[PDB]
Amino acid sequence: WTFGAGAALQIPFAMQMAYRFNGIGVTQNVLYENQKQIANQFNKAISQ
Amino acid sequence: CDVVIGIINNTV
């Protein structure tokens, strides 16, 4: 998230979107327990 | 403990 103001942090982006779950204000529980779920939901969004 | 990579035991 240090990007823009900053150079970089090299984060593998499930972690980044975990912190994106929290500035949208939801849990982390959905994430890994919906690993492929959310991933391929997004992938269907990609094809859409 | 389902989609766990976290190794951490000994937890307090």
Swiss-Prot record, chain B:
Glycosites: N9
Function: Acts as a viral fusion peptide which is unmasked following S2 cleavage occurring upon virus endocytosis.
Protein name: Spike protein S2'
Lineage, opening ranks: Viruses, Riboviria, Orthornavirae, Pisuviricota, Pisoniviricetes
Encoding gene per record: S
Residues of the full protein shown: 1108 to 1119 of 1255
